[PDB]
């Protein structure tokens, strides 16, 4: 069985429950995603050697 | 040392071994810096999220799209309804396409 | 929050407007305008005006004051001294 | 160390004397209070001296390792 | 601004809510002046930095004072011009001092 | 067809139009129910029942407090809103529902490989109790200490004498 | 839509409505913890989730008691 | 003192009688609760007089023999 | 334990709908460099009935396979392929013997388990006949390690917990052996 | 000692009859408990042994030399606070009986002391959430201990809501860290300090910044401190800062490992705003407790500059500043409670209403203190001049050490701003001194037979009856001279701060 | 002497992601409440554990 690992719909659609300092950073701030994309980019760049 | 990453049956889960090897590397006296343990940290984070492997899957799907390859020709067959895991799909000799019973085991 | 926001001029201005809705003799009303003589109010007409003035300022004249008030200015003085805002619920103030 | 404890006892007399002015009483009011106050801060002064003497020993031992660390940096 | 309008419509008979909404409320000129002043500040700060090959307190003083004056002329129309110049000089001097001190930290 | 989206949209619509305190406690019930049902499927059946066991008892105590405080304020206070603007607000919030911006993490599916090494299989609640009473017994005792403080705290705040 | 602080309109105009908002906000953190623990197959996170439920229940009781006494004080003459 | 409240440290037996008569919901609830730990302290007596404890259950995974692998093992080969 | 996972079938199709579960098949076999093996074809009930007979017959191969896993240092699935095939063949041999020597007794036992929620305590009569037949034809004895020989629960004469509903085939077969075998 | 003795006090208080005398004697029992707790803690915990750091209770708690010093400070300051409720502060029943009215006063304090001491020791995100709520809940109960007071219950309602939001932010930060890493122990998290979102720890600090009244969340703190009774404001405005600031220093110590410059700027931005509001905010106020609330905000900003730098000099600066500020905080509130006996009695314009909960509520109620009690007035003047930073008082060395850490780490902007803020705040500090003494020569030939102290009956007209009780006057005398005469022992005290190590070693 | 003393103490040694203090003295996982032998992913042998990093006590 292959399935998604996304958060519950209530966590990302409730008018109140989805608002927090960390959830806003995940949703609107690219600081986390830009840094984690480096690890993904390092994978391809380390093939040729 | 407190227990972390405990499986649903009281034992270590899938990613405890990665976490344990990180702790052993960090607390080992022979090391001068934490640089040798950097690769072990990536493996533990890869065990939980699989972000690099999902990225690899993203490239393969995108690469096949530009080549014109059909997803059903190079992918893996799958069934979306559990009641339709029929004996014909399972390859049984006398396998029929009638739905299987999943109401009450 | 719970404090009077009235002024002598505003109270007098609204007092005149209320008294001009009746059949008073004169429309020129000031502090020294007497109910009995200048306005020509009898026992029941005066009490009708006093209750009407009570409704405007959300105040209640006591028995002694209402049975001895003579001029409009005394009504103005009573309203200024005794008026209070009605207490609100807990949600109105702290929220 | 007697001079040190004499100073601490002098400080205790000052605290009691300053207390008398706060309470608005003559400075001779209940003279036994100065004896209690002086001995209280003498006990604090005896403990304070042990704290400082102990701290001097600890500082010297740490300084030795700090000098070794500085020598590696200056090389 | 639109969200705060909904809060006004959610209830207008509660004095406590109205008092705090009035403090955060901005006039129409402010809603227009503020983005223009900040936008002008961003442009002039970057434009002056490129001229000098680096950020200086002189450029930040000029960028802050001019941008503040541009903004002040929008939402502070009912004031003397010299009054807006004095505030623009004051605002520009503060950010010039900010750059002179090395922003929030000297770093390396 | 994810019907959880429709339920949350209905719940969100009434949140913006709720006026009295009774409609607010009804919002709370209309919030726990989607949480419990979405927990009952997918992730964790154990905590779906735990949420029902604990929060439903809190709701009733919350409700009985409302009966002692309602003071006619919202039975005649006017609200303006507007049907068009309320739908526009909900429509714009519906546009963005991606809580995370790791597209690979959200679009690529993963599987786990089961193993037979755990011949001793028990429920997750037993493992939680095994660790809570042995590994983290201090947390359990401090929680009881907090519960003791609440019992004393409630009495001193509420009791007249 | 979150950055314009849209949730400030979804909260009602009563003191008890603020209490309900806090319970929902804390409940969102617990749901997230259960989401992470279930994926990781980590019972430590489920221990954290249970603690968050118990602690949040204590918070509601203390806040309600303060609000109960606050409402009591205004209606406290009781001359009758 | 025909019906006085006994002092616990002076008449412990009479003090217990007061609560057993006037507060039955307290005296006997504690009495039932006390027997729990009491039986727990009597466990060593049962360990020596009645029977011994059971062998611990093999709830720790597969029992691995504490020895090196047998390199001389064959059979069922390819 | 009915906790939902990503490794097996969940409780209901609503869980699949929320997870968007795809039941994925692979049409590729093991590479030719790995020698082929014949997989065990016994279902749950026969395996539970023959669990102690597989352990008795294939104890050294079970231990060797498990010792390979521990000594592989994380590379168990790949390194211990050779040891895995020994266990599969040995386990298959036990089931093959049960179908050639004790088929009537073997089938009586695991059909009782299917009739009684797969609980050992509810099929003592059928198990006793099976245990006797296996010992007399295969020299294999059920043993529960860690306890004295006479304190084994399957040999208990008067168990506290007994099946609610008797299995008629087990009752008839048990009586046929009581009078005949023990004259 | 604390936990075991607390249970005994809880049962004993509910058994004995309700009376003011028994409550006061029970308060003295709580004083003995804290004194015994201090003796036990000093017997087993030493600075040298704890330098490395020792884990406790399955690594859920971690105690080091830095943590141990604050715990000893917390116990000592709590001892001085219990003296207020364990003894007379004015000697008048109409005033002093408020402290003896609530029996659970000592019980709630003992609950909070356990939370205060354990908070800097937290080594797990789970126990961090548990302890921070244990401390927060105890503060709400103490704020609402006078449940017959409209302001006390209103403040506690405000305190509960603001703190609960901060607790949610703290919980939200810890949960987000668990999602990224899957670990709950801080030391395990430190292994991945370079691979977790470091701004999630900034979310954790934001929740902690709310609980200490930092800007822009300052508003609720000023409102609560002014409305709450002086005996309650004295505790809730100082004790939470003793533990949370220590925990913030530890968290900032871990954050500086990766040295995120963006993280420092955000904290610098909040410190800059707090100095502006802390200085200009108190310029136009008429309440003394409102003035002290702005003073509290400004001084916390000064300590946060040392915390933000997080260097060897920061340990010396923070430890010294927190100790001397607490002593000054106790001294000022001790004097405020006592001097209520010099208030004139009416026998009116502005219809000023003064309640029994806060007898001293306005700055001008301190008028003619130079004449009423010259020794108490000078003691207040010494304390105020310490807050200003006049050398060689304790306050100057606190700001002197903070400036050293700030300028050494390159915070030139904050160091200059903190000195401009100090000059601005001197204006309202000097206003207190103006009220005390600037009218002495005109009111020297005045008659005051209407003061509160004048209502106290005399014993025999021959006994020399002091106006102030022995205990509270002695505490003021001791604290005043320690602030004044710190130059005598300043060198040795800093040497003690030299030995307080947070994983420095070498 | 005083200037030399203050220079030693006031010097803050550089910390980075390669050199910092972690207060863990043992490797976890030697014993689990149940099912200690899982998928054999625990490769850390406690019978041949190398000496752990020890904390430095400058006063000893
Ligand atoms: C409001 C008006 C207040 C005065 C305006 C700012 C004056 C500041 C100044 O001295 O002039 C600087 C500014 C040009 O900016 P600058 O950094 O000098 O660019 C490099 C040119 N070589 O000159 C101007 O743009 C003007
Ligand atoms: C867009 C969202 C809202 C903006 C963010 C606000 C929150 C962050 C600011 C931190 C301070 C929080 C202050 C409380 C929040 C402000 C709420 C507010 O906007 O109220 C407006 C207030 C009243 O304005 P008023 O004109 O009297 O009423 C309007 C009626 N038409 O007007 C005010 O007085 C508010 C200003 C308070 C003073 C803050 C000053 C901070 C320090 C600034 C200078 C920095 C000091 C260092 C300078 C040198 C630096 C190098
Ligand atoms: C469960 C089956 C039996 C119940 C079915 C009742 C259906 C009514 C709507 C159920 C709640 C859906 C979500 C809405 C949140 C609560 C909002 C509310 O106050 O109830 C809606 C009801 C509609 O009447 P209306 O006049 O439009 O609203 C007042 C306008 N000033 O206005 C009212 O105040 C009437 C309230 C009646 C009592 C309802 C108590 C709450 C019921 C919750 C049980 C279902 C749980 C939520 C399921 C949907 C989740 C989105
Ligand atoms: C104080 C007295 C405690 C000693 C005691 O009562 O017995 C302890 C007992 C150890 O004695 P033993 O049974 O001989 O050990 C077995 C060795 N194979 O150990 C036991 O048998 C367990 C005793 C359980 C009761 C101790 C706790 C009672 C109070 C609970 C609170
Ligand atoms: C009551 C005062 C008791 C003072 C005890 C100070 C103390 O706790 O020990 C010093 C402590 C470090 O102690 P440590 O290094 O761990 O062990 C060596 C101790 N010789 O260092 C510390 O952490 C103590 C920090 C607080 C210092 C407080 C200074 C005294 C406060 C003024 C006392 C006023 C006394 C008023 C008397 C009222 C009764 C009349
Ligand atoms: C030689 C010795 C020198 C010693 C002194 C050195 C410093 C001198 C400072 C000079 C500037 C202040 C003097 C002039 C200001 C006069 C203020 C004023 O006239 O009114 C206030 C003004 C609004 O004007 P209005 O109230 O209408 O008055 C009628 C004017 N026709 O209100 C305003 O518009 C002012 C602008 C709004 C407030 C801005 C605040 C931002 C921060 C300002 C700097 C504060 C820095 C503090 C740093 C520590 C705290 C962070
Ligand atoms: C009406 C009153 C007005 C004011 C009058 C003032 C008179 C002063 C009295 C004389 C005092 C005296 O003689 O002090 C001398 C003694 C003995 O010094 P030592 O043991 O050698 O210490 C070494 C001194 N070095 C370093 C200068 C060599 O020090 C004391 O006891 C100090 C008293 C405590 C001061 C407060 C700071 C320390 C607090 C510790 C806990 C935080
Ligand atoms: C070994 C260390 C401790 C010192 C030994 C003495 C302890 C106190 C017991 C004596 C009895 C007593 O305190 O009696 C109470 C006295 C007198 O008070 P009064 O106002 O005159 O009472 C009025 C009585 N008439 C009517 C007879 C006049 O108070 C004092 O003198 C206050 C000073 C307390 C002692 C000093 C403590 C210093 C601690 C500071 C260190 C940090
Ligand atoms: C007195 C200081 C005078 C400095 C003059 C200066 O800094 O000159 C004015 C600067 C321009 O300097 P710039 O363009 O950044 O550099 C110059 C060119 N360079 C790059 C080649 C070097 O701008 C400003 O108005 C900054 C605001 C001045 C604030 C001063 C605050 C001082 C506080 C007290 C510190 C102890």
DSSP secondary structure of J79-101: HHHHHHHHS-SSS-HHHHTTTTT
In this structure, are residues J309 and J406 in contact, taking their beta carbons and an 8 Å threshold?
yes
Q: Which atom of ligand 4 is nearest to the CA of H48?
A: 14
Pairwise CA distance, residues J415 & J246, whole Å: 21
Q: What is the resolution of this structure in A?
A: 2.8
Which of F80, F85, F89, F90 to probe by mutation at the E interface, max E CB count within 10 Å?
Answer: F80
Residue of A nearest to B82 (CA): A1
Q: What tokens appear for C38 in the block?
A: 């200048």
Pairwise CA distance, residues J431 & J434, whole Å: 5
I85 interaction partners in chain H (CB closer than 8 Å): 76, 78
Integer-rounded Cα radius of gyration of chain I = 20
Pairwise CA distance, residues K7 & K1, whole Å: 10
Pairwise CA distance, residues C40 & C21, whole Å: 14
Tokens 């669990």 sit at which residue?
I51
Whether chains E and K touch (3+ CB pairs under 8 A) is answered by no
In this structure, are residues J197 and A48 in contact, taking their beta carbons and an 8 Å threshold?
no
User: K16 has which bridge partners?
Assistant: K19
Q: Which atom of ligand 7 is nearest to the CA of J327?
A: 42
Coil vs helix vs strand at F57 = helix
In this structure, what DSSP letter does residue B12 have?
A: B
J186 interaction partners in chain B (CB closer than 8 Å): none
Q: What tokens appear for I27 in the block?
A: 């049409």
Pairwise CA distance, residues J120 & J213, whole Å: 18
In this structure, are residues J123 and J59 in contact, taking their beta carbons and an 8 Å threshold?
yes
Coil vs helix vs strand at B78 = strand
Pairwise CA distance, residues F120 & F116, whole Å: 10
Q: What tokens appear for H18 in the block?
A: 């007061």
CA distances from I122 to I105, I110, I157 (A): 16, 11, 14
Residue of C nearest to J161 (CA): C95
Reported for I90-93, long-range contacts at CB under 8 A and 24+ positions apart, including other chains, are I90/H75, I90/H76, I90/I54, I90/I57, I90/I58, I90/I61, I91/I40, I91/I54, I91/I58, I92/I38, I92/I40, I93/H76, I93/I57
Ligand 1 binding pocket includes E95 (Cβ within 6 Å) = no
Pairwise CA distance, residues D20 & C29, whole Å: 70
Q: Which ligand is nearest to the CA of D44?
A: 8
Coil vs helix vs strand at G30 = helix
ω into J250 cis (within 30 of 0): no
Selection from K8, I135, A6, B26 nearest residue D73 by Cα: K8
Which of K1, K12, K59, K60 to probe by mutation at the D interface, max D CB count within 10 Å?
Answer: K59
* K41 class by beta-carbon count within 10 Å (0-12 exposed, 13-18 middle, 19+ buried): buried
CB neighbourhood size of J428 (10 A): 19
Chains with ≥3 Cβ pairs under 8 A against B? A, F, G, I, J, K
* CA of D10 relative to ligand 7 center, distance in Å: 8
Which H or E run includes A1? Answer: none
User: A3 has which bridge partners?
Assistant: F110
Selection from F14, J166, J175, G28 nearest residue A18 by Cα: G28
B78 conformational bin, left if phi > 0, alpha if psi -120 to 50, beta if neither: beta
Whether chains A and B touch (3+ CB pairs under 8 A) is answered by yes
Q: What tokens appear for E53 in the block?
A: 């090959």
Pairwise CA distance, residues E52 & E50, whole Å: 6
Q: E strands along E1-108, which residues?
A: none
Ligand 2 binding pocket includes E8 (Cβ within 6 Å) = no
Selection from C73, C4, C65, C83 nearest residue C35 by Cα: C73
Q: Which atom of ligand 8 is nearest to the CA of D42?
A: 2
Which H or E run includes C58? Answer: none
Coil vs helix vs strand at I148 = coil
Residue of G nearest to A15 (CA): G7
* G77 class by beta-carbon count within 10 Å (0-12 exposed, 13-18 middle, 19+ buried): exposed
Ligand 8 binding pocket includes D33 (Cβ within 6 Å) = yes
CB neighbourhood size of I116 (10 A): 19
Asked if J413 reaches chain E (Cβ–Cβ under 8 Å), the answer is: yes
Whether chains J and H touch (3+ CB pairs under 8 A) is answered by no
Q: Which atom of ligand 1 is nearest to the CA of E59?
A: 17
- Total residues found in chain H within this entry: 78
User: K19 has which bridge partners?
Assistant: K16
Q: What tokens appear for D6 in the block?
A: 């004499």
User: F110 has which bridge partners?
Assistant: A3
8 Å CB contact of C90 and G71: yes
Which H or E run includes E102? Answer: none
Selection from G23, G52, G34, G27 nearest residue J132 by Cα: G52
ω into E45 cis (within 30 of 0): no
Can you count the helices (H) and strands (E) in chain G?
3, 0
* CA of F24 relative to ligand 1 center, distance in Å: 57
Chain Cα centroid distance, residue G43: 24
Can you count the helices (H) and strands (E) in chain C?
5, 0
Pairwise CA distance, residues I147 & I145, whole Å: 6
In this structure, are residues J497 and J319 in contact, taking their beta carbons and an 8 Å threshold?
yes
Contacts of I26 (CB under 8 A, 6+ apart): B76
Q: What tokens appear for F114 in the block?
A: 């089961």
Contacts of C31 (CB under 8 A, 6+ apart): C12, C71, C72, C73, C76
CB neighbourhood size of J249 (10 A): 25
* Alpha-carbon dihedral sign for residues K17, K22, K24, K26: positive
Return the ∠ at Cα J75 (arms to J213 and J339), rounded to 5°.
Answer: 70
Which H or E run includes I24? Answer: strand I23-24
8 Å CB contact of E3 and G4: yes
In this structure, what DSSP letter does residue A35 have?
A: H
User: J362 has which bridge partners?
Assistant: J287
Chain Cα centroid distance, residue J195: 36
Q: Per the residue annotation, which of C30, C42, C48, C58 is the catalytic one?
A: C42
In this structure, are residues B18 and G55 in contact, taking their beta carbons and an 8 Å threshold?
no
In this structure, are residues J124 and J56 in contact, taking their beta carbons and an 8 Å threshold?
no
Pairwise CA distance, residues H30 & H23, whole Å: 11
Pairwise CA distance, residues C80 & C77, whole Å: 5
* CA of E77 relative to ligand 1 center, distance in Å: 24
Contacts of E54 (CB under 8 A, 6+ apart): none
First to last CA, chain D: 44
Q: What tokens appear for J311 in the block?
A: 């260097």
CA distances from K58 to A21, D61, J47, J315, K10 (A): 41, 7, 12, 17, 16
In this structure, are residues C53 and C80 in contact, taking their beta carbons and an 8 Å threshold?
no
Pairwise CA distance, residues J85 & J97, whole Å: 10
In this structure, are residues J229 and J357 in contact, taking their beta carbons and an 8 Å threshold?
yes
Q: What tokens appear for J274 in the block?
A: 């707090």
Ligand 4 binding pocket includes H37 (Cβ within 6 Å) = yes
CB neighbourhood size of J437 (10 A): 20
Residue of J nearest to A36 (CA): J195
Integer-rounded Cα radius of gyration of chain B = 22
> Ligand 2 atom 29: the closest Cα is on which residue?
E23
CB neighbourhood size of J270 (10 A): 19
CA distances from I12 to B81, D46, F43, I15 (A): 11, 76, 12, 6
Selection from I53, I158, I154 nearest residue I105 by Cα: I53
3-class SS letters over J358-393: CCCCEHHHHCCHHHHCHHHHHHHHHHHHHHHCCCCC
G38 interaction partners in chain I (CB closer than 8 Å): 4
CB neighbourhood size of A21 (10 A): 18
* G53 class by beta-carbon count within 10 Å (0-12 exposed, 13-18 middle, 19+ buried): buried
Pairwise CA distance, residues E17 & E22, whole Å: 9
In this structure, are residues J143 and J156 in contact, taking their beta carbons and an 8 Å threshold?
yes
First to last CA, chain K: 23
In this structure, what DSSP letter does residue J206 have?
A: H
User: I72 has which bridge partners?
Assistant: none
CB neighbourhood size of K29 (10 A): 24
> Ligand 3 atom 11: the closest Cα is on which residue?
F30
Give the helix ranges, DSSP H, for chain H: 12-22, 24-41, 43-49
> In b/e form, how buried is each residue of B29-55, taking b as 16+ CB within 10 angstroms?
eeeeebeebeebbeebbebbbbbbebb
Q: What tokens appear for F161 in the block?
A: 């004498």
CA distances from D66 to D17, J50, J346, K12 (A): 46, 19, 68, 11
* CA of J151 relative to ligand 4 center, distance in Å: 54
Can you count the helices (H) and strands (E) in chain I?
9, 1
Selection from J336, J330, J347 nearest residue J287 by Cα: J336
Q: What tokens appear for B50 in the block?
A: 């699989």
8 Å CB contact of K41 and I74: yes
User: C34 has which bridge partners?
Assistant: C71
In this structure, are residues B14 and J182 in contact, taking their beta carbons and an 8 Å threshold?
no
In this structure, what DSSP letter does residue J62 have?
A: E
In this structure, are residues J177 and J189 in contact, taking their beta carbons and an 8 Å threshold?
yes
Q: What tokens appear for I167 in the block?
A: 């299995």
Phi, psi dihedrals of residue D73, rounded to the nearest 5°: -65, -40
Q: C42 catalytic, yes or no? A: yes
Q: What tokens appear for J118 in the block?
A: 């354990």
Tokens 């720790």 sit at which residue?
H60
In this structure, what DSSP letter does residue C16 have?
A: H
8 Å CB contact of H77 and I90: no
> Ligand 1 atom 4: the closest Cα is on which residue?
E62
User: I23 has which bridge partners?
Assistant: B79
Contacts of A24 (CB under 8 A, 6+ apart): G2, G3
């Amino acid at each position: 069985p292959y399935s998604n690992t996304r958060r519950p719909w209530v966590l990302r659609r409730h008018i109140i429950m989805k608002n927090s300092p960390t959830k806003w950073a995940r949703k609107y701030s690219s600081r986390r995603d830009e840094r984690e994309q480096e690890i993904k980019d390092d994978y391809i760049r380390g093939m040729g050697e | 040392a407190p227990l972390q990453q405990v499986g649903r049956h009281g034992g270590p889960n899938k990613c405890f071994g990665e976490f344990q090897r990180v702790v052993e590397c960090m607390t080992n006296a022979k090391h001068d810096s934490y640089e040798p343990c950097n690769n072990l940290k990536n493996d533990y984070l890869e065990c939980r999220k699989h972000k690099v492997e999902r990225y690899k899957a993203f490239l393969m799907q995108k690469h096949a799209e530009e080549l014109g390859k059909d997803p059903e020709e190079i992918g893996a067959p799958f069934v979306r309804k559990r009641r339709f895991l029929t004996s014909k799909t399972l390859g049984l000799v006398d396998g029929d396409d009638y739905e299987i019973g999943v109401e009450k085991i | 929050q719970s404090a009077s926001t009235l002024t002598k001029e505003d109270v007098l201005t609204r007092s005149v407007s209320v008294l001009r809705g009746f059949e008073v003799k004169t429309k020129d009303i000031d502090l020294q305008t007497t109910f009995v003589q200048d306005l020509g109010m009898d026992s029941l007409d005066l009490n009708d005006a006093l209750v009407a003035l009570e409704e405007e300022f959300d105040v209640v004249f006591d028995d002694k004051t209402a049975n001895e008030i003579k001029t409009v200015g005394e009504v103005v003085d009573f309203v200024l001294a005794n008026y209070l805002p009605t207490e609100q619920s807990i949600n109105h103030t702290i929220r | 160390m007697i001079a040190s404890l004499a100073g601490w006892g002098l400080f205790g007399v000052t605290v009691r004397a300053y207390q008398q002015g706060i309470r608005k009483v003559p400075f001779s009011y209940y003279p036994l209070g100065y004896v209690y106050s002086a001995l209280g801060w003498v006990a604090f002064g005896y403990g304070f001296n042990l704290w400082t003497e102990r701290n001097d020993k600890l500082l010297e031992k740490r300084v030795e390792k700090l000098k070794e660390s500085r020598n590696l940096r200056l090389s | 601004h639109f969200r705060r309008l909904m809060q006004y419509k959610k209830g207008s008979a509660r004095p406590g809510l109205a008092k705090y909404l009035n403090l955060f409320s901005l006039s129409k000129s402010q809603l227009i002046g503020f983005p223009v002043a900040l936008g002008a500040f961003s442009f002039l700060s970057h434009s002056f930095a490129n001229l000098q090959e680096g950020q200086t307190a002189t450029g930040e003083f000029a960028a802050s004072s001019i941008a503040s004056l541009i903004g002040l002329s929008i939402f502070r129309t009912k004031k003397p011009l010299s009054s807006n110049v004095a505030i623009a000089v004051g605002m520009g001097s503060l950010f010039g001092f900010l750059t002179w001190a090395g922003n929030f930290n000297l770093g390396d | 067809m994810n019907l959880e989206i429709l339920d949350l949209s209905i719940l969100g619509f009434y949140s913006l139009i709720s006026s009295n305190s009774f409609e607010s406690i009804a919002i709370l019930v209309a919030t726990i129910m989607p949480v419990i049902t979405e927990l009952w499927y997918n992730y964790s059946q154990l905590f779906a029942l735990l949420y029902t066991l604990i929060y439903v008892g809190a709701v009733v105590i919350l409700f009985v407090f409302i009966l002692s405080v309602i003071n006619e304020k919202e039975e005649y206070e006017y609200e303006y809103s507007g049907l068009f603007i309320l739908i526009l607000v909900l429509l714009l919030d519906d546009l963005d529902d991606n809580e995370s911006n790791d597209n690979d993490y959200n679009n690529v599916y993963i599987t786990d490989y089961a193993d037979w090494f755990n011949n001793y299989n028990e429920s997750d609640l037993s493992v939680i109790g095994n660790l809570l009473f042995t590994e983290y017994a201090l947390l359990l005792l401090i929680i009881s200490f907090i519960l003791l403080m609440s019992i004393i705290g409630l009495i001193l705040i509420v009791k007249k004498d | 839509m979150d950055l314009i602080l849209l949730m400030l309109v979804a909260v009602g105009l009563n003191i008890i409505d603020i209490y309900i908002m806090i319970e929902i906000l804390i409940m969102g953190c617990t749901v997230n913890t259960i989401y992470s623990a279930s994926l990781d197959n980590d019972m430590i996170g489920l221990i954290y989730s249970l603690i968050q439920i118990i602690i949040a229940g204590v918070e509601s009781a203390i806040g309600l008691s303060i609000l109960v006494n606050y409402n009591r004080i205004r209606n406290s003459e009781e001359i009758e | 003192a025909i019906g006085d409240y006994p002092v616990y440290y002076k008449q412990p037996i009479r003090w217990l009688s007061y609560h057993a008569h006037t507060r039955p919901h307290v005296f006997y609830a504690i009495a039932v609760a006390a027997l729990g730990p009491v039986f727990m302290m009597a466990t060593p007596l049962r360990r020596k007089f009645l029977y011994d404890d059971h062998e611990p259950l093999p709830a720790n995974g597969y029992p691995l023999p504490n020895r090196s692998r047998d390199k001389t093992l064959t059979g069922y080969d390819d | 334990s009915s906790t939902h996972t990503n490794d097996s079938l969940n409780s209901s199709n609503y869980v699949d709908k929320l997870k968007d579960t795809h039941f994925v098949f692979e049409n590729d076999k093991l590479p030719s460099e790995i020698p082929d093996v014949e997989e065990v074809g016994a279902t749950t009930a026969p395996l539970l009935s023959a669990a102690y007979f597989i352990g008795a017959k294939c104890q050294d191969y079970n231990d060797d396979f498990m010792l390979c896993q521990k000594e592989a240092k994380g590379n168990g699935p790949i390194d211990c392929l050779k040891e895995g095939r020994r266990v599969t063949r040995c386990a298959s041999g036990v089931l093959k013997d049960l179908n050639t020597h004790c088929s009537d007794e073997f089938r009586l036992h695991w059909q009782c388990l299917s009739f009684s929620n797969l609980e050992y305590k509810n099929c003592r009569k059928a198990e006793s006949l099976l245990n006797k037949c296996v010992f007399e034809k295969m020299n294999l004895v059920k043993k529960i390690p860690g306890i004295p020989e006479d304190r084994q629960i399957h040999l208990k004469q008067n168990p506290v917990l007994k099946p609610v509903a008797l299995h008629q085939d087990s009752e008839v077969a048990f009586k046929k052996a009581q009078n005949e075998n023990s004259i | 000692m604390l936990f075991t003795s607390l249970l005994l006090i809880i049962v004993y208080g509910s058994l004995v009859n309700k009376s003011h005398l028994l409550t006061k004697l029970i308060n003295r029992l709580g004083l003995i408990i804290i004194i015994y707790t201090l003796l036990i803690h000093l017997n087993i915990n030493t600075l040298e042994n704890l330098s490395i750091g020792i884990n406790m209770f399955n690594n859920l708690l971690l105690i080091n030399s830095f943590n141990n010093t604050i715990i000893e400070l917390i116990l000592i300051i709590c001892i001085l606070y219990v003296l207020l409720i364990s003894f007379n502060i004015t000697g008048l029943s109409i005033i002093d009986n408020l402290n003896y009215s609530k029996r659970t006063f000592i019980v709630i304090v003992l609950f909070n002391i356990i939370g205060l001491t354990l908070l800097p020791l937290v080594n797990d995100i789970m126990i961090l959430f548990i302890i921070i709520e244990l401390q927060s809940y105890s503060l709400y109960l103490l704020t609402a201990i006078f449940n017959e007071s409209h302001n006390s219950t209103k403040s506690a309602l405000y305190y509960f809501i603001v703190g609960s939001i901060a607790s949610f932010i703290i919980l939200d930060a810890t949960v987000s860290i668990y999602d990224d890493l899957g670990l709950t122990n801080i030391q395990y998290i430190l292994m991945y300090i370079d691979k977790l979102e470091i701004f999630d720890l900034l979310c954790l600090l934001f929740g902690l910044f709310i609980k200490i009244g930092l800007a822009p969340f300052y508003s609720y703190s000023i409102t609560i401190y002014s409305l709450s009774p002086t005996i309650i404001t004295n505790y809730i405005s100082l004790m939470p800062k003793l533990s949370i600031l220590t925990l913030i220093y530890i968290i900032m110590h871990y954050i500086n490992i990766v040295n995120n410059t963006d993280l420092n700027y955000v904290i610098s931005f909040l410190i800059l705003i707090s100095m502006f509001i802390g200085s200009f905010g108190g310029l136009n106020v008429i309440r003394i407790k409102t003035l002290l609330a702005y003073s509290s905000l400004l001084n916390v900003s000064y300590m946060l500059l040392a915390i933000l730098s997080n260097s060897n000099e920061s340990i010396i600066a923070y430890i010294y500043y927190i100790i001397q500020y607490s002593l000054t905080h106790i001294n000022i509130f001790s004097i405020i409670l006592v001097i209520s006996i010099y208030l004139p009695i009416m026998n009116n314009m502005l219809n000023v209403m003064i309640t029994k909960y806060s007898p001293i509520e306005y700055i001008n109620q301190l008028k003619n203190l130079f004449i009423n009690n010259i020794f108490i007035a000078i003691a207040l003047c010494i304390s105020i001049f310490s807050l200003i930073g006049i050398p060689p008082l304790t306050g100057f060395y606190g700001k002197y050490l903070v400036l050293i850490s700030g300028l050494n780490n390159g915070y030139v902007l904050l160091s200059i701003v903190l000195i401009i803020a100090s000059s601005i705040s001197t204006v309202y500090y000097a206003t207190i001194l103006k009220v005390l003494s600037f009218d002495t020569l005109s009111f020297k030939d005045i008659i005051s037979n209407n003061l509160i102290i004048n209502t106290s009956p005399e014993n025999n007209n021959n006994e020399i009856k002091p106006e102030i009780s022995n205990v509270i006057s002695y505490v003021i005398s001791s604290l005043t001279l320690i602030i004044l005469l710190i130059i005598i022992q300043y060198e040795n005290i800093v040497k003690g701060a030299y030995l307080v190590l947070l994983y420095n070693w070498v | 002497s005083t200037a030399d003393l203050y220079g030693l103490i006031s010097f803050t040694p550089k910390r980075d992601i390669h050199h910092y203090v972690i207060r863990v003295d043992e490797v976890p996982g030697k014993h689990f409440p149940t099912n200690t032998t899982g998928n054999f992913g625990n490769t850390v042998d406690f019978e041949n554990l190398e000496p752990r990093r020890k904390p430095i006590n400058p006063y000893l």
